[PDB]
Every structure is written in structure tokens, then in C-alpha cells.
Design a protein around this ligand. Structure first.
Ligand SMILES: *[C@@H]1O[C@H](CO)[C@@H](O)[C@H](O)[C@H]1NC(C)=O
Ligand SMILES: *[C@@H]1O[C@H](CO)[C@@H](O)[C@H](O)[C@H]1NC(C)=O
Lengths: 48, 284
């Protein structure tokens, strides 16, 4: 479809790689696995 | 065309206990500093696995089954084990799958192969070490899938050093999707008897939408022939020291302790002994 810009800390709707959601998209400093791109917490909610 | 092989020595299969082996990431989601309960297909803890050795000449090339996924471990030094065949009949009556790590590429073929009863592993090694003959199958009628990976060079030189390769693989086949998880490690100079203790997590590597049925699988070897191996096309050859362990997967509930970077530092079963069940139910 389309390729837009990147929005810094501000309440904005997002569809990162086809992941519909709403929330502030801040920077993160957590190491990742080079086969997974998702992220969850104790409550099993998308976080990163 | 193919020929029946001879001069093989029969030995009963040995058994060895598995020490905390066969743990892989089950999904594509990253978690940090949690204790997650996953009900998936794993290798049961402290279950024992089948042992095969190759060096009489110890020609061990049997036909093992494929129930619900397979854990395959290999202690190796010079890439003796190369190829992997999967199928139901292996006589061109039904589709079959094949992975070959030959000199050209990593070839994956989903074809109606009329596999021989004893497919050779010719790899005729002159002063230089390449493959000169190919008698794995005879012909294919009309197949579906061919894939060739990135072309890379390979040595095949007859290295006869110490054991420094430990390769672990997990095979799954769910809903027509064939999945390979893997982990390769250089093992230190160590006594060559069995697989040491410790932990390791197998990152997912390959997913293929083959959509075929697999019931039986077989491994292949790399026989080397020189002036020291007199004989006809199926008598004189050299194999080299290597061993491989085979285990079968079962549906179990595990508890994995994700570390604070994202890797599985430890895992515990929930059906082995009452202490494990207590740990599972208390999530501690
Ligand atoms: C290992 O597994 C085989 C599977 O048939 C079983 O016969 C044997 O009792 C098990 N235990 C040992 C110590 O070999
Ligand atoms: C990764 O692991 C090691 C120790 O566990 C260390 O580099 C660091 O604490 C961890 N986290 C990072 C690098 O973000």
C-alpha cells in the first residue's frame, strides 16, 4: 500500500507491519531476536 | 540405475539418556523476564534416544519413522551426514521430499522420486574432493517444487581431526507446513561418548508450505573412496568417525524462564515428577 514517515512521542494511530493499534510510539532500548518482531509483557499485551 | 550393497555388519542400536535437550522457541513473539507456560510438541525430559555410529566399517543407514516431528542430533567433524529424504513409499507412486547438501547448493526437491532400495552416497573423491556420481534416485515423472539456496563453496577434504561439530535439529509438519529449527555449536575437545549436559535454545530457521504427507525419513552419509578402498561400485569406501542420536517428540506442557534479553535460560517439565508439577502449578 503506502510508506509514510515516522512519528515521535505523540498519541497517534499506527499500523506497524499490519498491526493496528493506538498509542504513543516512543523509542525503545530493548534487545530483540532476529527472527521475531513482536513484544509482550506479563499481561500478554503488545508493548514493543 | 542402482545396485544392492553388501559387506555390512549388523549391530544392535544403543540407547542413551537425554539431558535437558530439545527446547526451541515455539512462537514468533518476544518476551522478557517472564515464566511462560507453553503446551506444544517437545522432547520429553529424561526420555532416552537411539544411538547410531559410523566409522565392518559400521554402515548405519536405516529407515526410521516420522510420527509427529523428530529431534536429530549429530556429533560430527567433517560433514559426513549430508542429505535427508522424506516420503511415504519412495517408489515414485507418491510425492517425496529431499534435501541435499551437495557441492552446488542446498537443494530442496518435492518430486515423485523412484528412490532406490539402497541409494548410494557416491561422492567419488579423487586427489581433489568433489562429487562425481549420483545414484540417489533414478528418475522423476512430473513434480511440483524445486528450490535452490545461495551457492557457496565447500571443501569436502578428508579432515580427520577432533570432534568439534554438534548439530541439533527439530522437524515439525503441521497443516501442510514443514518447519526446521536448528542450532550448530563447536564442541570443545571432549571425550567422544555422548552428548554433554547444559542448555541450548533452537532458533527457528525454515518454514516451507509443501503440503504433502511424510511418514518415513532417512539420513545420508558421505563415503570416500581412494586407493585404500579396493572394490566395485558398492564395496570399497571410507566413512569416517561420526555419530547421530534420534528422538521423537510428544505433546507436553513446559514452563520456560525467558531471560531479561529474550532467550530461554531454563525450562522445566510439568509431568516428570511431583516436584516438577508443584513448580509448574506454583509458577516458580
Ligand atoms: C530406554 O528406552 C527403551 C525403549 O524401548 C526401553 O526399552 C528402556 O527400558 C529405556 N531405558 C533404558 C535404561 O534403556
Ligand atoms: C544481555 O545479556 C548480558 C548478560 O545477561 C548483558 O550484555 C546484558 O545484561 C543483557 N542485556 C542487554 C545487552 O541489553
Amino acid at each position: 500500500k503506502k510508506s509514510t514517515n515516522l512519528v515521535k512521542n505523540k498519541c497517534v494511530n499506527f499500523n506497524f507491519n499490519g498491526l493496528k493499534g493506538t498509542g504513543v510510539l516512543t523509542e525503545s532500548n530493548k534487545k530483540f531476536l532476529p527472527f521475531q518482531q513482536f513484544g509482550r509483557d506479563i499481561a500478554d499485551t503488545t508493548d514493543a | 540405475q542402482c545396485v544392492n550393497l553388501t559387506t555390512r555388519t549388523q549391530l544392535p542400536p544403543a540407547y542413551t539418556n537425554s539431558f535437558t535437550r530439545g527446547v526451541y522457541y515455539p512462537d514468533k513473539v518476544f518476551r522478557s523476564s517472564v515464566l511462560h507456560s507453553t503446551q506444544d510438541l517437545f522432547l520429553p525430559f529424561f526420555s532416552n534416544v537411539t544411538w547410531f555410529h559410523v566409522i565392518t566399517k559400521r554402515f548405519d543407514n536405516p529407515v526410521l519413522p516420522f510420527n509427529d516431528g523428530v529431534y536429530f542430533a549429530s556429533i560430527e567433524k567433517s560433514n559426513i551426514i549430508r542429505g535427508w529424504i522424506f516420503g511415504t513409499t519412495l517408489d515414485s507412486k507418491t510425492q517425496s521430499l529431499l534435501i541435499v547438501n551437495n557441492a552446488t547448493n542446498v537443494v530442496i526437491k518435492v518430486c515423485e522420486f523412484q528412490f532406490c532400495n539402497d541409494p548410494f552416497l557416491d561422492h567419488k573423491n579423487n586427489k581433489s574432493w568433489m562429487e562425481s556420481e549420483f545414484r540417489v534416485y533414478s528418475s522423476a515423472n512430473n513434480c511440483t517444487f524445486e528450490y535452490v539456496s545461495q551457492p557457496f563453496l565447500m571443501d569436502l577434504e578428508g579432515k580427520q581431526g577432533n570432534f568439534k561439530n554438534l548439530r541439533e535439529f527439530v522437524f515439525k509438519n503441521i497443516d501442510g507446513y514443514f518447519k526446521i529449527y536448528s542450532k550448530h555449536t563447536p564442541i570443545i575437545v571432549r571425550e567422544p561418548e555422548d552428548l554433554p549436559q547444559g542448555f541450548s535454545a533452537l532458533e527457528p530457521l525454515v518454514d516451507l508450505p509443501i503440503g504433502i504427507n511424510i511418514t518415513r525419513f532417512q539420513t545420508l552419509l558421505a563415503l570416500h573412496r581412494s586407493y585404500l578402498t579396493p572394490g566395485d561400485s558398492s564395496s570399497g569406501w571410507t566413512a569416517g568417525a561420526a555419530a547421530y542420536y534420534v528422538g521423537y517428540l510428544q505433546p507436553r506442557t513446559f514452563l520456560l524462564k525467558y531471560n531479561e534479553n529474550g532467550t530461554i535460560t531454563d525450562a522445566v517439565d510439568c509431568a516428570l515428577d511431583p516436584l516438577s508439577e508443584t513448580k509448574c502449578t506454583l509458577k516458580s
